[PDB]
């Protein structure tokens, strides 16, 4: 297991989006559905020149799993996924720039919902969960586990669990108070109004 330190900015960004009052957390489902939207847009252009980058999975969609007994609400994709430089330093270098201007954007009045326009969207997670954990397999690289309780670190490893084949999970581990993502009839209304065009199949677990 190694532990790294998040960009200054990023780690600012996680406390804010964690101390801030603001009672419109749903955003954070659409936020990683167009994470995942956009990871199996990806793969998909990727295969038109080169098929065989779909060896590992041919199905294109999205799972969303609650499990009540673990309190976790879990995105599933079967996207390009992210390889370890992904994990450890080049998405953050990206978000470094985006989470600068989100975080003046904000100063000047803008909306924390507005959060996807600057490409930093899956920090919204923490809108809802104490721990956030990502596990992820690319066609060019092993199975991650990506894991973070904020505080200003976060851990990868190889990841030790089931192989995915190809694709993202991003495990949310609510916080005490936010189960209500975890019922059926909440998950569904927030994915009717904010997700009802992704253009790929999202399946809704049911729980038991
Ligand atoms: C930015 C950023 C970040 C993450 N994703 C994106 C967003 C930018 C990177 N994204 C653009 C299209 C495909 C790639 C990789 N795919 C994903 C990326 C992100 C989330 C989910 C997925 C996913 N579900 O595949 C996750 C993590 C690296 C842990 C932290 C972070 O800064």
Same mark, same amino acid.
């Given at each position: 297991?190694?532990?790294?330190?998040?960009?200054?900015?990023?780690?600012?960004?996680?406390?804010?989006?964690?101390?801030?009052?603001?009672?419109?957390?749903?955003?954070?489902?659409?936020?990683?559905?167009?994470?995942?939207?956009?990871?199996?847009?990806?793969?998909?252009?990727?295969?038109?020149?080169? =098929?065989?980058?779909?060896?590992?999975?041919?199905?294109?969609?999205?799972?969303?799993?609650?499990?009540?007994?673990?309190?976790?609400?879990? %995105?599933?994709? *079967?996207? $390009?996924? /992210?390889?370890?430089?992904?994990? $450890?330093?080049?998405?953050?270098?990206?978000?470094?720039?985006?989470?600068?201007?989100?975080? &003046?954007?904000?100063?000047?009045?803008?909306? %924390?919902?507005? +959060?996807?326009?600057?490409?930093?969207?899956?920090?919204?997670?923490?809108?809802?969960?104490?721990?956030?954990? #990502?596990? *992820?397999?690319?066609?060019?690289?092993?199975?991650?586990?990506?894991?973070?309780?904020?505080?200003?670190?976060?851990? #990868?490893?190889?990841? *030790?669990?089931? =192989? /995915?084949?190809?694709? *993202?999970?991003? $495990?949310?581990?609510?916080?005490?108070?936010?189960? &209500?993502?975890?019922?059926?009839?909440? +998950?569904? &209304?927030?994915?009717?109004?904010?997700?009802?065009? +992704?253009?790929? =199949? $999202?399946?809704?677990?049911?729980?038991?």
């Amino acid at each position: 297991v190694e532990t790294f330190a998040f960009q200054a900015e990023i780690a600012q960004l996680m406390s804010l989006i964690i101390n801030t009052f603001y009672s419109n957390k749903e955003i954070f489902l659409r936020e990683l559905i167009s994470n995942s939207s956009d990871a199996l847009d990806k793969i998909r252009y990727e295969s038109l020149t080169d =098929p065989s980058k779909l060896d590992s999975g041919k199905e294109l969609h999205i799972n969303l799993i609650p499990n009540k007994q673990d309190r976790t609400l879990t %995105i599933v994709d *079967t996207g $390009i996924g /992210m390889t370890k430089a992904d994990l $450890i330093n080049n998405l953050g270098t990206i978000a470094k720039s985006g989470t600068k201007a989100f975080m &003046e954007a904000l100063q000047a009045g803008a909306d %924390i919902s507005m +959060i996807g326009q600057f490409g930093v969207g899956f920090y919204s997670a923490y809108l809802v969960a104490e721990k956030v954990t #990502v596990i *992820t397999k690319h066609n060019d690289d092993e199975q991650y586990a990506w894991e973070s309780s904020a505080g200003g670190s976060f851990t #990868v490893r190889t990841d *030790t669990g089931e =192989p /995915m084949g190809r694709g *993202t999970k991003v $495990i949310l581990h609510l916080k005490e108070d936010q189960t &209500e993502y975890l019922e059926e009839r909440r +998950i569904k &209304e927030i994915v009717k109004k904010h997700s009802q065009f +992704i253009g790929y =199949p $999202i399946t809704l677990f049911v729980e038991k």
